[PDB]
Design an enzyme around this catalytic site. Sequence first.
Site, mmCIF file in Angstrom:
data_model
loop_
_atom_site.group_PDB
_atom_site.id
_atom_site.type_symbol
_atom_site.label_atom_id
_atom_site.label_comp_id
_atom_site.label_asym_id
_atom_site.label_seq_id
_atom_site.Cartn_x
_atom_site.Cartn_y
_atom_site.Cartn_z
ATOM 1 N N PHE A 275 12.640 -1.670 -0.722
ATOM 2 C CA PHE A 275 12.740 -2.812 0.184
ATOM 3 C C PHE A 275 12.725 -4.137 -0.577
ATOM 4 O O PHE A 275 11.883 -5.001 -0.352
ATOM 5 C CB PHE A 275 11.621 -2.757 1.216
ATOM 6 C CG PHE A 275 11.500 -1.430 1.903
ATOM 7 C CD1 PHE A 275 12.349 -1.092 2.939
ATOM 8 C CD2 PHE A 275 10.535 -0.523 1.518
ATOM 9 C CE1 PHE A 275 12.235 0.126 3.573
ATOM 10 C CE2 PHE A 275 10.420 0.697 2.152
ATOM 11 C CZ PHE A 275 11.272 1.019 3.179
ATOM 12 N N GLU B 188 6.638 -0.195 -1.533
ATOM 13 C CA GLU B 188 7.986 -0.240 -2.099
ATOM 14 C C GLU B 188 8.520 -1.674 -2.143
ATOM 15 O O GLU B 188 9.501 -2.020 -1.488
ATOM 16 C CB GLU B 188 8.945 0.676 -1.328
ATOM 17 C CG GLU B 188 8.765 2.160 -1.591
ATOM 18 C CD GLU B 188 9.403 2.610 -2.888
ATOM 19 O OE1 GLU B 188 9.959 1.756 -3.610
ATOM 20 O OE2 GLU B 188 9.355 3.822 -3.185
ATOM 21 N N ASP B 189 7.838 -2.506 -2.926
ATOM 22 C CA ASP B 189 8.311 -3.849 -3.255
ATOM 23 C C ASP B 189 8.493 -4.713 -2.011
ATOM 24 O O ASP B 189 9.529 -5.345 -1.817
ATOM 25 C CB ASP B 189 9.612 -3.783 -4.058
ATOM 26 C CG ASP B 189 9.374 -3.675 -5.544
ATOM 27 O OD1 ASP B 189 8.492 -4.394 -6.059
ATOM 28 O OD2 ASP B 189 10.067 -2.871 -6.200
ATOM 29 N N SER B 190 7.472 -4.754 -1.169
ATOM 30 C CA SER B 190 7.441 -5.678 -0.050
ATOM 31 C C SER B 190 6.221 -6.577 -0.161
ATOM 32 O O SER B 190 5.316 -6.347 -0.967
ATOM 33 C CB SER B 190 7.447 -4.941 1.290
ATOM 34 O OG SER B 190 8.768 -4.603 1.662
ATOM 35 N N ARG C 240 6.554 -0.933 -14.110
ATOM 36 C CA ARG C 240 7.338 -2.068 -14.571
ATOM 37 C C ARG C 240 6.725 -2.772 -15.772
ATOM 38 O O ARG C 240 7.452 -3.442 -16.511
ATOM 39 C CB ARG C 240 7.524 -3.073 -13.433
ATOM 40 C CG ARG C 240 8.412 -2.575 -12.308
ATOM 41 C CD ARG C 240 8.392 -3.541 -11.141
ATOM 42 N NE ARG C 240 9.448 -3.272 -10.170
ATOM 43 C CZ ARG C 240 9.391 -2.323 -9.242
ATOM 44 N NH1 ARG C 240 8.334 -1.534 -9.161
ATOM 45 N NH2 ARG C 240 10.397 -2.158 -8.399
#
Lengths: 255, 66, 95, 34, 528, 95, 44, 521, 115
Positions: free
Chosen positions: E159, H204-206, H370
């Site tokens: 997302f 998830e990258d929010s 990362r």
Amino acid sequence: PYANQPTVRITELTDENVKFIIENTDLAVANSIRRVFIAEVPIIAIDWVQIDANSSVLHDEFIAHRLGLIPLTSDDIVDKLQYSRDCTCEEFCPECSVEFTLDVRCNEDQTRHVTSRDLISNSPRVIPVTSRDDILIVKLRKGQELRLRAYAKKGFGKEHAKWNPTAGVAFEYDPDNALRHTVYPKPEEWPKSEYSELDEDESQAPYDPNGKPERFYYNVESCGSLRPETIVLSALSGLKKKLSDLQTQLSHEIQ
Amino acid sequence: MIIPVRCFTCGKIVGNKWEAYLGLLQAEYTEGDALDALGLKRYCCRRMLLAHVDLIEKLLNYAPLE
Amino acid sequence: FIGKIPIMLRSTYCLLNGLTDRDLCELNECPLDPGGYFIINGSEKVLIAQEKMATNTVYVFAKKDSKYAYTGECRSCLENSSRPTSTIWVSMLAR
Amino acid sequence: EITPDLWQEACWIVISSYFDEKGLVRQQLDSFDE
Amino acid sequence: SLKQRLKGKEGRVRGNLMGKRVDFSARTVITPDPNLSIDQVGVPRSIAANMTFAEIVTPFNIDRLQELVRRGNSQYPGAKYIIRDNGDRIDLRFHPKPSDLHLQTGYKVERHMCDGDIVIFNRQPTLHKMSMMGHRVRILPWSTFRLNLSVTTPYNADFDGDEMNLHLPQSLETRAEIQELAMVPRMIVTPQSNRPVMGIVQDTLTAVRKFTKRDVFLERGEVMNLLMFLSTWDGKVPQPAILKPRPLWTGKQIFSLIIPGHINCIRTHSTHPDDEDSGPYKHISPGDTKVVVENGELIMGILCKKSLGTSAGSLVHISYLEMGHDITRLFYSNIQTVINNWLLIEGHTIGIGDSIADSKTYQDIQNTIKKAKQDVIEVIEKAHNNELEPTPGNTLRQTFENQVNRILNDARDKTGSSAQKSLSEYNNFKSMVVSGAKGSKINISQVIAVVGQQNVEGKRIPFGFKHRTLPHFIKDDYGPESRGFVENSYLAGLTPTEFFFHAMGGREGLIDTAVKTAETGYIQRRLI
Amino acid sequence: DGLKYSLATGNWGDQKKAHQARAGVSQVLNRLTFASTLSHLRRLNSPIGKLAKPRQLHNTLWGMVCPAETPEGHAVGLVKNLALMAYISVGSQPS
Amino acid sequence: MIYICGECHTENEIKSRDPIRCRECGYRIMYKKRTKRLVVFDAR
Amino acid sequence: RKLRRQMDIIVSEVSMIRDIREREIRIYTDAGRICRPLLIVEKQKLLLKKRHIDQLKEREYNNYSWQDLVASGVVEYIDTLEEETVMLAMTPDDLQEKEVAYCSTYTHCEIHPSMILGVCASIIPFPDHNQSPRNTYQSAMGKQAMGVYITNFHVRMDTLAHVLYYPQKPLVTTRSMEYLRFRELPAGINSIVAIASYTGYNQEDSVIMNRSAVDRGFFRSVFYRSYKEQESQEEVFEKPTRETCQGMRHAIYDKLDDDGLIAPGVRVSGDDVIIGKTVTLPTKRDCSTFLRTSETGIVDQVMVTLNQEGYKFCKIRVRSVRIPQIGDKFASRHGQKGTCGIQYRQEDMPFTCEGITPDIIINPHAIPSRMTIGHLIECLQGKVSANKGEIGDATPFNDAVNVQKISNLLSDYGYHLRGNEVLYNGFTGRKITSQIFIGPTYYQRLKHMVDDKIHSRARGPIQILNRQPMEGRSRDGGLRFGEMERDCQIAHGAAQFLRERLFEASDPYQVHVCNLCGIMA
Amino acid sequence: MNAPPAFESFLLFEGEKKITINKDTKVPNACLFTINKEDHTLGNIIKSQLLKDPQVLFAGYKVPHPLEHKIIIRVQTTPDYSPQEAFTNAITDLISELSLLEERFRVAIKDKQEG
DNA sequence: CAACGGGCGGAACTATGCC
RNA sequence: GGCAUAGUUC
Ligand SMILES: [Mg+2]
Ligand SMILES: [Zn+2]
Ligand SMILES: [Zn+2]
Ligand SMILES: [Zn+2]
């Protein structure tokens, strides 16, 4: 199967700060009061702006947004007013809003600061808190001009954060970690709380298996709109009216 | 652009402190001492004055349309 | 008169060359604008530096499966006069 | 007259003087002028 | 020319017959929503009010459809058209006359999309058939495509600015096709490798391990809450494990309620040693590994990626094969909701305290590095004195490079092992690595101890300048630092030469990523 | 018209022969942020059309070209940006 | 119709089918004047 | 070399190379060679002296500058192929000194090794604690952040422009940003970021954003768009009338003035008429320009002039304030990009002992794979700086800034040395068992919003040659159903759905055919 | 564009009922209460007060979706006692506690200032 | 053995010049 | 209206 018997003690009381201790109360009740301080305490704030002339360097929505966040003293008339959705008037009447007017022009060679000192209200009891420095609204060059009319409704912090009457609500229980609600991987790196009752060598209180959180410590700092005692009282009355209306609706439904 | 009226994180009013902060700095104060004097107690409020860049001064240079 | 040549902003032959920040603000030009672009039909154009192999030098390479074993080229140009390049190759046939 | 262990300010004084003299887009301006 | 018209892509055949733009399609950003079911998708009210589905009027629904037509195109639960039997269209976007609003059976009303509608959701590129699955529409306030998190793995979707496509089937026949064939719960086990294609993803997965540790004892109120979030719960609170001197439940005692039916399974935790299965305590497992599920109850063990993950024979795979899609869907949803609302109590983070080691470990790492550099120097001295002997099948350069790379790899691995074994039981890197959520022991090693050697095209850093790597080295320098062995960790930082060498190393990865994609797509197209 | 057209379109050459003319010079200036403007004004370009060699980070780019700033996609390693203190010679004559 | 000149800041009447020139300064860029219609802003 | 250093006969730009082994001397006066300045080391001591440093630090009212430094023979320009005959030293006071002899014949020295980074990579703090792909990603995303892009934006009619309300300069800044002027025209805001897994909406990258902070102006911006139209028959700016013009639409012409232009300050919703223009059909045809659908902006400025030829010319600008929704894209200075997941009010966000709710909550799973430790170190340094009152220094290669020194400095203000802080749950009020890592990090609001990306279609406009749906969100086009998608549907076996997608949903048609010859009749 | 107005989180619209009572058929003496336009501020107090009752066997609450404002409370009680009585007693006890707390805070203010 | 011809990812979003 | 080129997202 009955209620508690809470007790209070006010450690410090100034013009912008109240520190108190609630005792013999459940954590859920203490946290609900803490939440009501922030959200559901009615406040007067500007909610309708009509800009007659804006030749400044900030656009109209920028200026209106800045105007909305200037706090107005609603100490005594916030209870008298009505919600604009709850009023018999067409759009605005003195019983549900307070009208403001700003009209500033710069004709000098020096930059002029338009502050909250220039907002003028019809009712003498709703004035910006910096009118017994000043909240800067915009700066004007030579030849630039600003003029508008604004209306101050009534609302609370659930709708918008300009009706939030507080600055920072410090809430804390069990300063020494006797209940082990938080677990420290290394207990000696952690600074002792302000209310800790330990020596300079011991870091954590010994475990208390048969204990529950009691003795919550508060610190309600006011943003100038209400004074920090009426913030607490309006929260206790404001929460109490929510529960009463729930009981009324349940009684109709059961019958 | 111009200093915000409220502190984003907590809501304390910092919109009346920029002129005083600049005056304190001009009066030979360190930034920490100036922020302490102005009553900015927590770092959420302190960063509002530390990191502010005042561009409205630059915008006032250009002449108005009228 | 043989035509009009576009002028790069802030260069020696622009109207903003050497002006102070107050004059730039008077002309409604940002004193922080770096300059170095052309104004063509309103829009602002930027030339992009284009890499090319160095001229007037002898380079000896080799090809994978060509007829020759080793090659050598000297891309030759004359002081940016004309005749852009003339790549003479001196190859050597394989064994 | 050496500058020992005071270097972390001397190097940045030099770099600031460089960027005051030249700037960031000096290549385009110089090339077009030439 | 006409041959150009018909030649390739964007040419008639391959660009307008084998693939063409369609109606009833939407595309917007996707954001997470852990409160949805596996087979549900959140749709903004604007898209739903813009897309329509034609419903045939029958005596079973004529009143409802007439009310929808009365609401009209303005109000969202409305309709846009009325299609007569003869086929002539009636508009409803403007104000019509009262006569045309008459409805009789056999008409068609093009109502707005509502809750429960079946749509096909896709993310490009479409690699396997788990990239186009059928979802059930739910209408939500803001304007992104909310979708669950276990469905991230089938789509390969994160997302961060991603978008996905929505296709709305227009007939009962195709709607029944999609419902019976391509619904999300029906595609849990893929036929490519006969494994579950979706599993718990990294946040319920980093927390189910902590939940299923032995220490987790739950109070009465916490049990009340967690059971309040269980959708397949009978209604009876189980007897607590610890009954005196205070009633306490356990995390396994509630995951047993989550697990459906009577499922029998035996897995193994990711930190299970190689002596428990052999020596004594085979069935006692001091470290609480060796997951055992009997009769649908988690008797023992810690749940991780190897139990709830997308591997063959996992707990979710057994649940599918034994109970079906309709129960595996509830399995996924219940696991996620219960574990998230418990995680609201325990919490999770990652920080410098979790990325910092101990002084003894730093001394060990520095000692190992110094020994490795000394050994490389010795090898170089032996090579210079010509005393190095070539290995059969290898050149002198090849054998020297092999010895140097072997020494440096041994150093990097030893420092990594020291960094791993010097961790703590509260370390969040260990929490996210042991549970299999995200990360690896090599990442922990690079953070703590040593970044390691940088390679270009499989070899050490080449001699870009005349016989040297950078202008800061003498000519013909084969030391570890000259050819790019970063002695420092990411926490300590990289010296400028190591920074440049690391950038040279990462450029190769970026290039391979940008290069492989087109060739992979072309291979797949040729196979198809 | 020749100068104006070549700067306006980017096809470096005559209008009649815009087939072999190299397109991609004279782009329209980016104005999203000041950093975008500066990094656009200091930009290079390699005229190479998939080989890894011209796309890698060579050792000789130390202090001349940024090791990090590069686009990702079909032009990774073919569009580059100057280092901070890098300069490009303007030219003279060796008399 | 009143347009304000962009250089001398002097407003002057210009009708349709009329070259857009400014008296007493000879400029060629004119800006429309702010409308008299009232628009309401919430202060949010 | 002596002549070039004196700057007498040979300009400083010329390079000289001696190939000692191959016995060749090469001198280049060419144009296009790329070169960078270097300090000169004569025996083992820099020719740069404290007198030079003082004369430089008195640069004002002294007319002593970089040219006067170059003319003294202190620094020098070295191009790429002259660098192959030089011995460089990264740091003077560290590499010139007596050691175990590595090289005792240094010929130059680096000014500062952090000058190897470009404009966009000079804003990353602690880039030497990051991963190279992350530095590359940040170099890409630094050109998309929204801040004040130029100080005279009020007189520019640019097709699209985006300016932030309240930009702030970083609390943790690199020394080389003063030359990029990031202090004067910044793009971003210092936000109190907590790295925790709160309610699962940041997975998830929010990003979880404080809605009460947003209500106070946090990360709010404006969007400016410009339209142009000239009257090139006879096109005329005029207000059309419904019952006199041939072409017409379902839009509103009542906003326009007499000459056909909207006055500034007039709120225009989507699908309205800004400029009214009419073509005299040989009796009038309408060619008015319409707002791009669903803008809901206010007219900001109208400019009337003459073009090159002499036709009347007009540019109209429209502004629309963009409040951060739950689809907008945000990113820090370390290659960590994400979209807003959900927004909580202040009462719901977790709070510390002092009532400091985070502005942004990001997932802890973004870090381990990362390896952006510059992010954590920037957070810690910002937490130190906001309390101390200084602005932290994060220039890449320092050796005088350690995590240990930062932690010791932070422990002196009453906080945990490693940055953690005990947070309380928002809904229930109970302490969270694990302490959370929270501090002020510098975040950016990227150009990619959701109001400019949402798109849907159901029986819209249709192409002319193929009679298929149009292409383009601006033209209400459809979504392509490509060959990969049809292969996926073949694998599914949904034959009827595939036929619907490829025939019925797209262009349907009917023809007649002869039963004898297969030719349309 | 799809932004709900801020007042929708606490204002009942035309038709919406504040509280609806439903029975639970899985277990005897169980009942579910659905409250519209409420949140944790009320759910938590009511749950924690229901748990104090010795005749309440289950008492919980949940918010089914953070974007939709609605509270569900489930309470099961021992026989010869009904969950509706438990709910009403809980609300009455909460009101009594809050009234006593307000009285004591007011007297504490009076003692603190001018005293 | 030499010369010739066809083949080379998938989606999506902005902008500008020209017929 | 269409052709071309450039940039960007995944
Ligand atoms: Mg992605
Ligand atoms: Zn009224
Ligand atoms: Zn604050
Ligand atoms: Zn004039």
